[PDB]
């Protein structure tokens, strides 16, 4: 069966979403697409990254080096294409702003653009947890964006219930 999502609730006609682990959906559905929420330098040292990478075995972070040391870091709000390993057929590595860093929310819509690339997607919320944007700003941004076939999974049920409250306003 390809990309078989289950559970996930329609926001939009193109935008999905579900309270559930991303490393735990690209288990089970095999998508085409699963999207790392990277750093400019696929470092997958925590978080979504590195949970992705470990579920790999660490042959994402192999990889990522080889693709870094061919053609330099990614830029904020940019991505690229690599192996979904045994996840998926690809990983889509994009690169969100980091607010607590510095960074410019306004790359958060050039982040959001990468997705529109790909048929179908499963996607974790840009931007979101230790990168400090606000979490229902992301979503709007994903919904006002996203032009493709997204299905995002948010792994905190206290967020998810914040975000679905937030969209049906
Ligand atoms: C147990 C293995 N899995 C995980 O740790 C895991 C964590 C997951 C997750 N986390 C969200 C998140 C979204 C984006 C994001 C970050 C976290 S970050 O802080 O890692 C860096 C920047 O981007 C939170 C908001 C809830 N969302 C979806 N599936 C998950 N799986």
């Known amino acids: 069966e390809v990309n078989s999502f289950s559970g996930y609730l329609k926001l939009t006609d193109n935008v999905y979403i579900k309270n559930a682990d991303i490393v735990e959906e690209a288990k089970k559905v095999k998508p085409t697409v699963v999207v790392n929420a990277a750093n400019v330098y ?60 510095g960074e410019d929310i306004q790359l958060l819509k050039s982040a959001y653009e990468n997705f529109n690339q790909h048929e179908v997607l499963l996607a974790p919320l840009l931007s979101a947890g230790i990168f400090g944007a606000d979490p229902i700003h992301s979503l709007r941004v994903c919904v006002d964006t996203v032009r493709t076939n997204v299905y995002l999974a948010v792994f905190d049920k206290n967020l998810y219930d914040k975000l679905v409250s937030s969209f049906l306003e």
């Open 42 to 101: 696929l470092k997958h040292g925590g978080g979504v990254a590195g949970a992705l990478n470990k579920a790999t075995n660490n042959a994402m972070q192999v990889e990522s080096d080889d693709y870094i040391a061919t053609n330099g870091p990614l830029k904020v709000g940019g991505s690229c294409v690599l192996s979904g390993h045994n996840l998926a057929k690809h990983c889509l590595h994009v690169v969100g702003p980091n607010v607590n860093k």
